[model samples]
Target: VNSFSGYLKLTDNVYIKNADIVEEAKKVKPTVVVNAANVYLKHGGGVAGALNKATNNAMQVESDDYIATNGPLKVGGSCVLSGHNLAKHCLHVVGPNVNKGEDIQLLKSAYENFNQHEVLLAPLLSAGIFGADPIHSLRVCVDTVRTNVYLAVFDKNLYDKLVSSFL
Candidate 1:
């Protein structure tokens, strides 16, 4: 039977290598973080999962929507859930990489969050360490995300902010 483990007990193919965990954490800019026991994403299966993949589903943030909202879900020697409890968008972001690219994505379904401008806050887990820097990962993530032509969320003002952040 499958069970969960703490960060110290889990295993993953990816390691920090010469990289410093503290520095990585620093770069990560985590607002709040923790480590906890016994957590799961509730395994939303079948049509729901398939619909999510096909339609860019914006799964709502709720109490049940997390692998380990309390902290890093570390399992003994096979996987480590990268728990990034950033802000009000608690207990969401469940799923592995079904796509070849991107970390966080703009949806064909932002309305699920931003309905009536209620602010559908989502976690921005920046894709890490695919190369020597974060920019490459950002490029891949951003490019795939930009394909969500279903929204005109980014415009010249937004584009300028990306290049010249001095604003």
Candidate 2:
């Protein structure tokens, strides 16, 4: 297993790091886990898919509620889910479905759209299914997450790149 190997301070409370996202969840027990999704919140693939499977589809149930109450989120808006099977809550952010070279800005917008909740756990945006550059995406996250954020990175190469950038 990979030891939690690196960290970067983005702000007084927000941090960026290289490690298993789920492992950190087990350790920190964050109040919210950021779930990247389309406005539909389908949890069909990428980080959302893994999280949905891990949490036994608690996210999906919450998504349904969000849809019922809030309807589909617009790009750069977010919804909160409570009683998550993992974290106490989940924050679902609507992000870009396609890279389209606009992902960096989109990701930054997503981060800004998150509600100011303490103890948040987030994965690298668009780095999984959307295939955006992890380093670039993370830079947006670091720039946008002004406080109360914990970034979870599982890609070794991406983590190495982030570490190098920090050094």
Candidate 3:
């Protein structure tokens, strides 16, 4: 049967583990992936950049077209974009940037925007270049995430901490 290995349980349905989200997203169905993006929806670095590159920059081109038509997404806003690659429609959410000195509530609210579902693969939002404290980011992520949102953490240190959080 299909079962996860070396994964931690945050809730009965939720899980966390170290994984390459880009690869995982490509393997999973369209509605399962989430993307952390800037308010401008620019896919410059980290997970966003990787995913954009995976889609041959078509995703970025679409995002640019999206912004040109709809305007930039506000902080803590989100929208779903069709997967230009195989098997993933990415839910793009703009997390609050520490660089902008945004309030914690915006970060909290960004995750709260997620819809009810059985499974979702999400990243540690704003915990990378956007710079939220890893612990604080983990707390916000764990405390707020609903659905069966399995966290695909990339850092070894954060992965260890994510495991410890469950233990």
On lDDT, the leading prediction is 3
> How close to the true structure is residue 164 of candidate 1, measured as C-alpha lDDT?
44
TM-score of each model, in listed order: 0.21, 0.82, 0.88
Candidates arranged by TM-score, highest first: 3, 2, 1
Q: Residues 52-156, candidate 1: write the lDDT tens digits.
A: 222233331332344245543322101222333222122232222324242333221221222222211121122221111223322332333321111111123
lDDT of 3 by residue, 1-167 (tens): 12345667777556777888887767654355788888788999988898888889988998999999999998988988877773456788889888889776788888876654456778877878777876677777767876667778888887887667553
Taking all chains together, the TM-score of candidate 3 against the true structure is 0.88
For every model shown, the clashing-pair count is: 7, 0, 1
Off by over 4 Å in 3: 1-6, 165-167
Selected candidate, larger TM-score, 1 vs 2: 2
Model 1 residue 89 CA deviation in Å: 6.2
Off by over 4 Å in 2: 1-13, 99-104
Model 1's TM-score against the true structure? 0.21
Pairs of residues clashing in candidate 3:
30-89
